[PDB]
Design a protein around this ligand. Sequence first.
Ligand SMILES: O=C(N[C@@H](CO)C(=O)O)c1cccc(O)c1O
Ligand code: NA
Length: 173
Amino acid sequence: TSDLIPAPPLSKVPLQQNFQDNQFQGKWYVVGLAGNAILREDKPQKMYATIYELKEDKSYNVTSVLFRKKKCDYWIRTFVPGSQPGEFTLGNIKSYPGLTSFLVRVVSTNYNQHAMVFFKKVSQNREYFKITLYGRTKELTSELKENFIRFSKSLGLPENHIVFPVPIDQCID
Ligand SMILES: O=C(N[C@@H](CO)C(=O)O)c1cccc(O)c1O
Ligand code: NA
């Protein structure tokens, strides 16, 4: 009825040392996507952007913008700070039907170029996980993308569960 690559132990997912929320705020482009529910379809995903607004209460108003059939779809959610800096939970998690658990963890970032962020959730009793490769520009180096693929494979994800959204100019600018 369902077959999912197991979610990795959170020991296999690093946390960015001394996470600086003021440095991380702003728009990132989703340069890479990987996870147990992600599948690479050659018949290819369009690039979408995500803007992290560091609010005065130190929460993030996360607004994602994607181009879809054929309009600018905006989806806005709230990430509230977790136990330690660099970790977040979903604001108003109870309002999402089926969603019982949700965690965000910033794996690594230099704030001005690249970032890797780990997502894990329990939806309908099924544990899903995802790693997103963020980029300040709509393109990154092969060094950056190769490290993302390497990190994805270390969490048990094969190549067809690792995708690189095609750059576009609509909505995300
Ligand atoms: O698989 C995920 N997301 C895909 C939609 O199902 C996606 O396309 O991003 C996914 C998995 C774990 C945690 C998440 O927040 C998440 O969005
Ligand atoms: Na995102």
